[PDB]
């Protein structure tokens, strides 16, 4: 068809200029002349788009298409003397339909200035090696003979090198192997052997609580997850009980020494577990199952304090609403546990070390619950209704958070 601009827009323009009482044939005469000039320029701006080898366009093809038709590039003002603004363009006007049309000059200075990129640089790679396209990141994607393994000996040697580097004898070797896991596109069809190596490892690595072996395997899990190419939820049924035990298990190794390390490992386990519930989500299978196991870990009495601290951390890192609903009716039990560890003279065991960590973590989570959906007031002795664990020091932490909010 031949689509033109509407004539009922051309009469609005004419009567808002001083030219009143225009006929319909006078008004139809305006909207076929200007609709041709739009069609003449958009067909002529198409020349610059096809010769600019882009199709997408950069605000500027219409600026050269106008200059080609001996009409000035600038829009929003027309100079009848032509001399200060010749056919050089001014880049158009950054205007919108949902524009407020009113702005504060001070706000524009307040708004941050964007950074400037490195200048264009030249980088060569390989599309084809003697006919075959390589999988580099610059590329898009009764006697009978014995069977041949689908995995290659380069791939099997790669698996052996990556697994012997990921057990962390040297740190630079680990870090590359972790980046190699994080971005190898062909790491599918090797993924059963990696999942089995992880799963089997943690289970025979908690027989003796070897913390590095576990911290390296958890970093291997994290490096497996952020790889975008591979399909993981076929293997997550082996991945999730491995991270579960890491968080909810006792430490054969004494904790007064690496419990800080152990705590860090638990945090890593709780980070990956929250990611494992963020992805791979279907109805009522994964997130609710680990939530139920965490809550019955919490509810059961006389539970190892290492297991208690790990389950507390796992319950805490589950997001905004989960602590808004699951960390409310239980403060009295937490306080009673802290009081029992405090009473009595035996501190040799790991009980109180576990108690102090649990209380600190629970108190910080309470702080956003106090900040997110409550107003501060009576920060001296009202917390004694919650067994008086953090009290005024908790109030001081809340005040520091308020100061950080003021700085923001």
């Amino acid at each position: 068809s031949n689509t033109v601009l509407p004539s009922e827009s051309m009469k609005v323009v004419a009567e808002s200029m001083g030219i009143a009482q225009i006929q319909e044939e006078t008004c139809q005469l305006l909207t076929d002349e200007v609709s041709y000039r739009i069609k003449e320029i958009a067909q002529d701006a198409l020349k610059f788009m096809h010769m600019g080898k882009r199709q997408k366009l950069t605000t500027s093809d219409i600026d050269y298409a106008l200059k080609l038709k001996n009409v000035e590039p600038l829009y929003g003002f027309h100079a009848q003397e032509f001399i200060p603004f010749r056919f050089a363009s001014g880049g158009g006007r950054e205007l919108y339909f949902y524009e407020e049309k009113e702005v504060d000059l001070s706000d524009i200075i307040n708004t941050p200035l964007p950074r400037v990129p490195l200048d264009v640089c030249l980088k060569a790679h390989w599309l084809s090696i003697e006919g075959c396209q390589p999988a580099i990141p610059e590329n898009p994607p009764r006697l009978k003979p014995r069977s041949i393994h689908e995995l290659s000996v380069e791939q099997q040697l790669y698996y052996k090198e990556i697994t012997e580097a990921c057990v962390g004898s040297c740190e630079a070797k680990r870090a590359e192997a972790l980046q190699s896991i994080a971005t190898d596109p062909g790491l599918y069809q090797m993924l059963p052997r990696f999942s089995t190596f992880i799963s089997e490892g943690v289970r025979v690595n908690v027989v003796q609580n070897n913390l590095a072996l576990l911290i390296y395997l958890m970093r291997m899990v994290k490096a497996l997850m952020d790889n975008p190419t591979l399909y993981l939820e076929k293997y997550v049924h082996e991945l999730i009980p491995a991270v579960m035990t890491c968080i909810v298990s006792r430490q054969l190794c004494l904790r007064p020494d690496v419990d800080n390390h152990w705590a860090l490992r638990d945090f890593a386990a709780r980070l990956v577990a929250q990611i494992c519930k963020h992805f791979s989500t279907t109805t009522n299978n994964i997130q609710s199952r680990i939530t139920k196991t965490f809550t019955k870990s919490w509810v059961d009495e006389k539970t190892p304090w290492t297991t208690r601290y790990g389950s507390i951390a796992g319950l805490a890192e589950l997001g905004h609403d989960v602590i808004k609903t699951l960390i409310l009716p239980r403060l009295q039990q937490e306080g009673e546990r802290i009081r029992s560890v405090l009473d009595g003279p035996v501190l040799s065991n790991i009980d109180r070390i576990g108690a102090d960590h649990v209380q600190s973590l629970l108190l910080k989570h309470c702080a956003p619950v106090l900040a997110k959906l409550r107003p501060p007031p009576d920060n001296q002795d009202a917390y004694r209704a919650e067994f008086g664990s953090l009290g005024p020091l908790l109030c001081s932490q809340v005040v520091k958070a308020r100061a950080q909010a003021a700085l923001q």
Partner: peptide, 25 residues
């Protein structure tokens, strides 16, 4: 939709806590 392979995925049909040995023989 119950016919979808997601229902037959091992993770949906497998309980992780039961799978963990937890040093149990």
């Amino acid at each position: 939709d119950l016919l979808a392979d997601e229902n037959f995925l091992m993770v949906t049909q497998l309980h992780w806590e039961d799978d963990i040995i937890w040093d149990g023989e």
